[PDB]
């Protein structure tokens, strides 16, 4: 089945090969095209690996640790929420109701 | 076309990269804006239809947000990027003895000497310490770490 | 963003006060709640002023609606802890005062001078100029 | 390896020598190779090289490109590296080195 | 076909929720019913959406009318067990997968391919291709 798929996607004529029981029979020329494409595809696969590694590594640390990053927005907004609610009575009540469950 | 949700996610990434406050990203950064959105573009993908300048080169061009939106859609979102199946059989070219193990020196050599060549600085930064005695590096564990 | 954790937390706070006619927080219920709360903050105008933040009859559904201000920031527990974490290289003893003061004041969605005074009056600190981030995270949700 | 098209060309010192096809028009190829010069020959006289995996191969029927240069190059590559014997399809091919061998 | 067994079963389910003003299931009653039910499925729109299946005011008589869909099959306990029994020659370990798949798909009032997927995702089975009929009978009425 692996040969059936491989021969089916590489566009080779049915005059140029035969399927057997243990071996596949090929005309001359054909395995040169496969070796050249194998070299080319391996080079294309290696650039994909290097690109995924750069995907992982191109974490801009200004998007995880700088001034106007997600976290400092959370600190500024939650601290701004805290300054309002540290005065309100029903904020203060629920904080001492629940230690008494 | 993109969703409103996709447009806002692409914008949230954009609003960090224009850090000078210009509403404009410097053209060099666009490949790493794409990496920041979880796509994995090759430098060959980056210099063609994404319109990037030379590597590590600033100043030459800048990109507005609305210009960035087809530069996500028609680029890495319009192609194959590779899967697990690619990497496993590409690594098996260098699996001499069939055990899922490749020498750390050979794996660093494939990253640094072949393809879109990695800096040694990049290679150490992506290395999770998985080197034994002369039991070397499990390459499947390496691929799963780099694709998580 | 009103979570199941938050609304169940609010449900028990409602249910401890309760006991009045089928699920409504009223004036007396609050007044005798203060008796077990250790503090005589039961003054009638202030007590009945807290009813003005709803249209009437404080059932549990109304009680959640009253807390609509509270949710308007409200990042969950370890998100605020992991937010402050990025400003600590030194590993508890935490954020140096000067850096934190700059970060709020002159950078970002900038703090006004009154906002800085509002925080320095209630921040935990040392005598050299360092600020406890984890103690600030505890102060936001409160347990003392 | 390079996609420059390495192919064997007729010469009169080495009967077939490795050449690089590069530029081709109609029946004529302007080819580079081992001496670094460019000359023009009929493409019909210029015959496919096998990739390095088939260099020194045990049996010549397992070469993908089968022509007299591929046969001569494999026999040269075998013989220069001490190996007297090579198979060719049904044949066993024997190149006598005139040395006594161990 | 609404049986005395079924309506009395429904009556206790109504009566446990109840306690609200003389025999009406309301929003609060459902909300505090969920507190003893172990799951925070108390979300206000979904809770008040369940009122739309009646014209108004869910008393016990209305509650039976709301369950009008439920009765539209609902053959009694041992009848479904007896129906499945006819298709078991081997006496518990029960119905072979291929035969059951044919029985539903190409025999009688034929199952659609979606209906077959809807069942295979929740049927009990072995690793060879047999299907527990009695465990399916238990799943229809549920007790786990």
Are A78 and C50 a contacting pair at CB < 8 A?
no
Are D64 and A29 a contacting pair at CB < 8 A?
yes
How far apart are alpha carbons A84 and A63 in whole angstroms?
28
Q: Using an 8 Å Cβ cutoff, are D16 and D34 in contact? A: no
List CB contacts (< 8 A) between C11 and chain E. 35
Q: Using an 8 Å Cβ cutoff, are D52 and D70 in contact? A: no
Please return the burial class of E67, using the count of CB atoms within 10 Å of its CB with bins 0-12, 13-18 and 19+: middle
Resolution (A): 10.2
List CB contacts (< 8 A) between C13 and chain A. 93-94, 97-98
Residue D9 exposure: Cα atoms within 13 Å on the Cβ side: 23
Closest CA of chain C from E21, distance in Å = 9
How far apart are alpha carbons B64 and B68 in whole angstroms?
6
Q: In 3-state terms, chain B is what percent helix, strand and coil (to 5)?
A: 50, 10, 45
Q: What is the CA radius of gyration of chain A?
A: 32
Closest CA of chain E from C42, distance in Å = 28
Any CB–CB contact under 8 A between A72 and chain B? no
H or E element at residue E6: helix E4-17
Nearest CA in chain A to D50: A32
Instruction: Consult the annotation and say whether E20 binds a ligand.
Output: yes
CA dihedral D44, D48, D49, D51 (to 10 degrees): 170
Please return the burial class of A26, using the count of CB atoms within 10 Å of its CB with bins 0-12, 13-18 and 19+: middle
Any CB–CB contact under 8 A between C60 and chain E? yes
How far apart are alpha carbons B41 and B75 in whole angstroms?
9
Grouping H, G, I as helix, E, B as strand and the rest as coil, residue A79 is helix
How far apart are alpha carbons A53 and D94 in whole angstroms?
53
Q: Using an 8 Å Cβ cutoff, are D42 and D26 in contact? A: no
Chains touching A, CB cut-off 8 Å, 3+ pairs: B, C, D
Q: In 3-state terms, chain D is what percent helix, strand and coil (to 5)?
A: 20, 35, 45
Are C109 and A82 a contacting pair at CB < 8 A?
no
Q: Using an 8 Å Cβ cutoff, are C26 and C58 in contact? A: yes
List CB contacts (< 8 A) between D48 and chain A. 29, 32
Pick from C4, C8, C60: CB nearest E28: C60
How far apart are alpha carbons C48 and C29 in whole angstroms?
12
DSSP D49: P
Q: Which of A59, A65, A71 to mutate to test the interface with C (most CBs of C within 10 A)?
A: A71
Instruction: Consult the annotation and say whether C88 binds a ligand.
Output: no
Residues belonging to chain E:
144
Pick from A67, A74, A101: CB nearest C80: A74
How far apart are alpha carbons E74 and D59 in whole angstroms?
77
**What are the residue ranges of helices labelled H in chain C?**
4-17, 27-35, 44-49, 60-66, 77-84, 97-105, 113-120, 133-141
Any CB–CB contact under 8 A between E40 and chain C? yes
Residue B64 CB contacts under 8 Å (≥ 6 apart), including other chains: B23, B24
List CB contacts (< 8 A) between C83 and chain A. 70-72, 74-75
Grouping H, G, I as helix, E, B as strand and the rest as coil, residue C5 is helix
- In whole angstroms, how far apart are CA D100 and each of D80, D96, E16? 16, 10, 107
Are D51 and A32 a contacting pair at CB < 8 A?
yes
Any CB–CB contact under 8 A between C119 and chain A? yes
Pick from D94, D19, D89: nearest CA to D60: D89
Q: Which two tokens stand for residue D98?
A: 């005139």
How far apart are alpha carbons C48 and B120 in whole angstroms?
70
Q: Using an 8 Å Cβ cutoff, are D22 and D32 in contact? A: yes
Q: Which two tokens stand for residue E43?
A: 């979300």
With tokens 């449900």, the residue in question is C11
| A29 conformational bin, left if phi > 0, alpha if psi -120 to 50, beta if neither | left
How far apart are alpha carbons E36 and E139 in whole angstroms?
23
Grouping H, G, I as helix, E, B as strand and the rest as coil, residue C126 is coil
What b/e sequence results for E101-113 when a residue is b if at least 16 CB atoms lie within 10 Å of its CB, and e otherwise?
beebeeeeeebee
**What are the residue ranges of helices labelled H in E18-144?**
27-35, 44-49, 60-66, 77-85, 97-105, 113-120, 133-141
What b/e sequence results for E23-49 when a residue is b if at least 16 CB atoms lie within 10 Å of its CB, and e otherwise?
ebbbbbbbbbebeeeeeeebeeeebee
Strand partners, C104: none
DSSP E54: S
């Amino acid at each position: 089945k692996a040969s059936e798929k491989l021969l089916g996607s590489i566009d080779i004529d049915h005059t140029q090969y035969k399927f057997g029981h243990t071996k596949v029979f090929f005309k001359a020329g054909l395995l040169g095209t496969l070796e050249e494409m194998r070299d080319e595809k391996l080079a294309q696969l290696i650039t994909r690996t290097q690109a995924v590694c750069r995907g992982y590594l191109m974490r801009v640390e200004f998007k995880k640790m700088m001034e106007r990053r997600e976290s400092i927005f959370c600190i500024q907004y939650n601290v701004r929420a805290f300054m309002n609610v540290k005065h309100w009575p029903w904020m203060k009540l629920y904080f001492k109701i629940k230690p008494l469950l | 076309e993109f969703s409103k949700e996709q447009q806002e996610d692409f914008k949230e990434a954009f609003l960090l990269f224009d850090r000078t406050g210009e509403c404009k990203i410097t053209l060099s950064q666009v490949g790493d804006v794409l990496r920041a959105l979880g796509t994995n573009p090759t430098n060959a993908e980056v210099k063609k239809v994404l319109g990037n300048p030379s590597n590590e080169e600033m100043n030459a061009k800048k990109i507005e947000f609305e210009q960035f939106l087809p530069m996500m859609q028609a680029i890495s979102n319009n192609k194959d990027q590779g899967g697990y199946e690619d990497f496993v059989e590409g690594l098996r070219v260098f699996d001499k003895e069939g055990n899922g193990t490749v020498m750390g020196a050979e794996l660093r050599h494939v990253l640094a000497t072949l393809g879109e060549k990695m800096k040694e600085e990049e290679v150490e930064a992506l290395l999770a310490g998985q080197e034994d005695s002369n039991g070397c590096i499990n390459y499947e564990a390496f691929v799963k770490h780099i694709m998580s | 963003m009103f979570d199941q954790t938050q609304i169940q937390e609010f449900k028990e706070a409602f249910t401890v006060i309760d006991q009045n006619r089928d699920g409504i927080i009223d004036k007396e219920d609050l007044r005798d709640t203060f008796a077990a709360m250790g503090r005589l903050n039961v003054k009638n105008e202030e007590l009945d002023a807290m009813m003005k933040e709803a249209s009437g009859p404080i059932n549990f559904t109304v009680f959640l609606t009253m807390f609509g201000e509270k949710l308007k920031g409200a990042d969950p527990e370890d998100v605020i802890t992991g937010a402050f974490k990025v400003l600590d290289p030194e590993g508890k003893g935490t954020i140096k005062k000067q850096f934190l003061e700059e970060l709020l004041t002159t950078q970002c969605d900038r703090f006004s001078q009154e906002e800085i005074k509002n925080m320095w009056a209630a921040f935990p600190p040392d005598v050299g100029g360092n600020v406890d981030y984890k103690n600030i995270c505890y102060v936001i949700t409160h347990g003392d | 390896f390079d996609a420059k098209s390495s192919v064997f060309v007729v010469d009169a010192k080495e009967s077939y020598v490795k050449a690089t096809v590069q530029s081709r028009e109609g029946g004529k190829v302007t080819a580079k190779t081992e001496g670094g010069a460019t000359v023009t020959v009929k493409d019909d006289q210029v015959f496919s090289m096998n990739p390095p995996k088939y260099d020194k191969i045990e049996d010549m029927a397992m070469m993908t490109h089968l022509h007299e240069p591929a046969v001569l190059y494999n026999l040269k590559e075998r013989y220069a590296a001490w190996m007297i014997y090579t198979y060719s399809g049904l044949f066993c091919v024997t190149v006598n080195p005139y040395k006594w061998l161990p």
